[PDB]
RNA sequence: AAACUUUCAACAACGGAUCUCUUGGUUCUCGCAUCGAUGAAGAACGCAGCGAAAUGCGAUACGUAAUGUGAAUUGCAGAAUUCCGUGAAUCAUCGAAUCUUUGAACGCACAUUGCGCCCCUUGGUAUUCCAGGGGGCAUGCCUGUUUGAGCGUCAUUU
């Protein structure tokens, strides 16, 4: 069954995938900014993802915002050029859902996330789904094939950077780039 | 001629330089992995027979316990009354304690020591009012537990 899920979802837009994106959207979006799990919405390719399983459940959901750069100040100003001068439109190097899954961890880091799927988009934000794992707990550590998460450091990271979309948004390359700095480099 | 004035002697005198001093600092190098909701870092306010502070400590207050050292004095011998062969205030001690009023600060507050609610137990003695000691009521999430919610929705003998 996994599998047609999988490439089930692979077709947006598409009749089905379509006529329920929309209801979904219209339902979903009215619910709290981040409205924290129910059961898992998309379970099909969540797996690739070492899906649900963890810890023995929780899978929170927020809206981020849709957009580009809110340049704070009301200025300049600030010489301007190497602008500086610029101000409406800069682009935000963050990650749009990285966004999301960091104010998820924040809305509660009981546990920690193991990683986070989209699942929608208006014209008013994009509507991401993270994971957790809640390591300060139960078989997560016990029966753990999976203490990875539990230990240490790797934790509360879900946003040290060392994540998954920031991981992508930095450097897993490997040649072709300056993608591991740090470094500065190089005095 | 002195006074005065300059000048150089010696003696004092202002001043604190030079010399030598070093329980600091400064830079090196080499090990080592630890804070807190089990209440941290920080703050007050207090605590010696005698103490202002630096220091240590918390109403068990320059300290309790416990060890070995100790073997003999501490706050070492300031004075002082001081007390000791049953182990004195010192080190180590963190396989124990005490740790006020606070601060992530926490029942509500807080330019005040102000204002509530439970539970236990004492006086007034009818539980329901007033006073005493003990224990307690933050938030976000995790997981189960336990009650009830909708025309989400299933099935039942009506």
Same mark, same amino acid.
């Given at each position: 069954?996994? $599998? &047609?899920?999988?490439? *089930?979802?692979?077709?947006?837009?598409?009749? !089905?995938? +379509?006529?329920?994106?929309?209801? =979904? @959207?219209?339902?979903?979006?009215?619910?709290?900014?981040?409205?924290?799990?129910?059961?898992?919405?998309?379970?099909?390719?969540?797996?690739?993802?070492?899906?649900?399983?963890?810890?023995?459940?929780?899978?929170?959901?927020?809206?981020?915002?849709?957009?580009?750069?809110?340049?704070?100040?009301?200025?300049?100003?600030?010489?301007?050029?190497?602008?500086?001068?610029?101000?409406?439109?800069? $682009? &935000?190097?963050?990650? *749009?859902?990285?966004?999301?899954?960091?104010? !998820?961890? +924040?809305?509660?880091?009981?546990? =920690? @996330?193991?990683?986070?799927?989209?699942?929608?988009?208006?014209?008013?934000?994009?509507?991401?789904?993270?994971?957790?794992?809640?390591?300060?707990?139960?078989?997560?550590?016990?029966?753990?094939?999976?203490?990875?998460?539990?230990?240490?450091?790797?934790?509360?990271?879900?946003?040290?950077?060392?994540?998954?979309?920031?991981?992508?948004?930095?450097?897993?390359?490997?040649?072709?780039?300056?993608?591991?700095?740090?470094?500065?480099?190089?005095?």
């Amino acid at each position: 069954a996994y $599998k &047609y899920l999988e490439e *089930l979802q692979r077709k947006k837009q598409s009749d !089905v995938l +379509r006529f329920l994106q929309r209801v =979904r @959207v219209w339902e979903y979006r009215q619910k709290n900014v981040i409205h924290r799990a129910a059961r898992p919405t998309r379970p099909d390719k969540a797996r690739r993802l070492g899906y649900k399983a963890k810890q023995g459940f929780v899978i929170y959901r927020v809206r981020v915002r849709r957009g580009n750069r809110k340049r704070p100040v009301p200025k300049g100003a600030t010489y301007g050029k190497p602008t500086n001068q610029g101000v409406n439109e800069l $682009k &935000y190097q963050r990650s *749009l859902r990285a966004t999301a899954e960091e104010r !998820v961890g +924040r809305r509660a880091a009981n546990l =920690r @996330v193991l990683n986070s799927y989209w699942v929608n988009q208006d014209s008013t934000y994009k509507y991401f789904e993270v994971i957790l794992v809640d390591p300060q707990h139960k078989a997560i550590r016990r029966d753990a094939r999976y203490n990875w998460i539990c230990d240490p450091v790797h934790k509360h990271r879900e946003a040290r950077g060392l994540t998954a979309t920031g991981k992508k948004s930095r450097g897993i390359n490997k040649g072709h780039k300056f993608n591991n700095t740090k470094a500065g480099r190089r005095k």
